[PDB]
Amino acid sequence: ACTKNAIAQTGFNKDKYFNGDVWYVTDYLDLEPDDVPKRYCAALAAGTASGKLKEALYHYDPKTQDTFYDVSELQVESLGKYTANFKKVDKNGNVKVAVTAGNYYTFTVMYADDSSALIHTCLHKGNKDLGDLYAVLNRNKDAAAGDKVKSAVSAATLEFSKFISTKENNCAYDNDSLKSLLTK
Ligand code: HEM
C-alpha cells in the first residue's frame, strides 16, 4: 500500500533534472521495508527524447544477480509530479514486457539540485504495489549524501539515518545503456 502524497520541490527545475544524464540511487527507504531487499543497486536516466519526457531505469540485486531495465514515458500531473508507464527491455531497448495497462509508477521530485535529488515513487503492477519508496540520488555514484539532500530528507519528516545505503554492494552500471534507452 502507498500512503504518501509526496510534495514536489518548490521551483523544481525540470530541464536540469531531465537533461539526459544519469542519476544513481545511493540510499533508499521503503515505508513497507519488506517490499524491497536490504542490498540493491539502482540507477536511472531522465530526459526529453524527441519531445517526449522519458526515464530509463536499471535494477540489479547484487546477491541474486536479478537484472532488469525499463523504458518509461512520463505524463505530467503537476510540476515535479509524474505518472509513468514502463516497458521491460533488454539493455538495448528490445521489448521484453510491453507497456501494459495497470503497470505504472508515480514519481515525485521532492528536492533536486545539479548533483543530488530526493524522489518518491509508488510502483503499481496491476493490483500490487511496492509501497512508498524514497530514494536519495546523486550524479556521482560514489557520493556520500551531503547536508543539502539530508536536510530535504528531514524536511519530508523522514530521517536519513534510517535509509539503506547501496554503497557496499560493488554496484557497477552501464551508463551508455541508460542514456540510449531514453530514445527507445
Ligand atoms: C523511477 C527509482 C526507482 C523507480 C522509478 C523504480 C521503478 C520500478 C519499476 C517500474 C519496476 C517494475 C519493472 C518491471 O517489472 O518491468 C520496479 C521493480 C522493482 N523495484 Fe524499483 N524503482 C526504483 C528504485 C528501486 C530501489 C532503490 C529499490 C530497492 C534502490 C527497488 C526495488 C525494486 C524491486 C525489488 C522490484 C521488483 C518488484 C517485483 O518483482 O514485482 N526499486 N521498480
Side-chain angles (χ1 to χ4, degrees):
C2 293
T3 71
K4 302 300 168 164
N5 182 2
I7 303 306
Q9 184 185 32
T10 299
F12 175 59
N13 190 324
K14 67 176 109 127
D15 292 347
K16 284 188 167 186
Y17 184 87
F18 291 102
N19 65 346
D21 197 8
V22 172
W23 288 104
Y24 304 99
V25 175
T26 61
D27 305 84
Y28 63 90
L29 180 77
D30 197 319
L31 299 187
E32 292 182 339
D34 296 336
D35 291 0
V36 300
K38 282 167 188 143
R39 305 319 179 297
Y40 215 79
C41 295
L44 64 82
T48 298
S50 198
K52 310 303 165 282
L53 198 68
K54 302 285 285 296
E55 291 180 334
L57 313 180
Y58 172 68
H59 286 71
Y60 177 72
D61 182 316
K63 291 283 127 267
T64 63
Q65 308 192 53
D66 187 15
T67 306
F68 47 99
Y69 290 86
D70 292 88
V71 172
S72 294
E73 295 169 307
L74 276 59
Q75 300 306 143
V76 176
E77 306 309 337
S78 57
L79 179 59
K81 196 162 188 83
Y82 306 95
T83 303
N85 72 21
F86 53 93
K87 55 189 185 193
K88 190 184 286 183
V89 294
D90 69 17
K91 70 158 221 275
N92 290 323
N94 306 302
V95 175
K96 298 180 73 166
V97 181
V99 163
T100 300
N103 280 5
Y104 73 97
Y105 58 95
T106 71
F107 190 85
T108 302
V109 181
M110 298 160 60
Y111 154 77
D113 67 9
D114 297 281
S115 293
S116 63
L118 175 63
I119 71 84
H120 169 277
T121 185
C122 178
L123 172 66
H124 303 258
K125 318 183 71 208
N127 271 181
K128 327 302 224 111
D129 68 62
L130 220 64
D132 295 278
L133 182 62
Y134 297 92
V136 168
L137 311 181
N138 205 278
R139 293 298 191 185
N140 171 351
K141 74 185 187 53
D142 290 307
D147 251 76
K148 192 154 192 226
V149 74
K150 289 184 62 168
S151 294
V153 171
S154 175
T157 318
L158 300 171
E159 297 276 3
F160 181 77
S161 66
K162 303 185 191 302
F163 281 55
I164 305 192
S165 188
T166 61
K167 75 188 177 177
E168 295 191 25
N169 301 316
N170 300 132
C171 299
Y173 311 89
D174 185 348
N175 272 32
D176 302 305
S177 160
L178 284 170
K179 288 176 159 166
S180 58
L181 281 178
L182 290 174
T183 76
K184 305 292 186 338

